[PDB]
Design a protein around this ligand. Structure first.
Ligand SMILES: CC(C)(C)NC(=O)[C@@H]1C[C@@H]2CCCC[C@@H]2CN1C[C@@H](O)[C@H](Cc1ccccc1)NC(=O)[C@H](CC(N)=O)NC(=O)c1ccc2ccccc2n1
Lengths: 99, 99
């Protein structure tokens, strides 16, 4: 769909059985979800942003459904205020910027 | 222009007589620029991101030329790693997300 930016670009994701809302974020290389229950194997990883760094759990090959579109990728789970869909996944659902 | 997301969405901006590169960021509410010389008054503000909070100088009515589009708005200058154009200016240059 086309999404204007007067409000935050928030979509519904279905991940690991759970429904969440996430921000479509072009300035994020990675996808970072708030602490949740995910099955499996994860690695320790540190990522950075404004303000500094956090330590997150890396899960690879996770299925995510972003606004009814399917994609599989690396998802990081840690202490982020808002769930962020970053560019590793935005390329999979075909998301482009327009101006 | 239409921008795909395989690489970071960077554009050229002209601000305060100076040429910079900045990231078009749909997940940023505000425009945050690294430390640079700007004329006039500024107010102190705290903003947050994933690793915490930073103290920024807020400037209002700043003219900014983003990929040849002129826009007037609030710009925050501070200790950010990369120059960020957030939704307060992206809505003024007519920026939309598409998938
Ligand atoms: C998620 C991750 C992959 C780690 N990437 C990033 O964090 C990169 C790092 C880059 C280098 C440093 C400068 C920022 C850029 C852009 N960011 C993406 C960038 O989109 C990031 C995503 C985000 C949204 C909401 C909350 C937290 C984080 N947003 C931001 O950093 C902007 C900064 C701002 N004042 O506008 N924050 C917000 O717009 C914003 C909104 C609500 C909030 C609620 C609570 C706490 C903080 C909140 N911050």
């Amino acid at each position: 769909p086309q999404v204007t930016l007067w409000q935050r670009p928030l979509v519904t994701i279905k991940i690991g059985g759970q429904l969440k809302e996430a921000l479509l974020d072009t300035g994020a290389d990675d996808t970072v979800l708030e602490e949740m229950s995910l099955p499996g194997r994860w690695k320790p990883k540190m990522i950075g942003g404004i303000g500094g760094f956090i330590k997150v759990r890396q899960y690879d090959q996770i299925l995510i459904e972003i606004c009814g579109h399917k994609a599989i990728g690396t998802v990081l789970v840690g202490p982020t205020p808002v769930n962020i869909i970053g560019r590793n996944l935005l390329t999979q659902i075909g998301c482009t910027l327009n101006f």
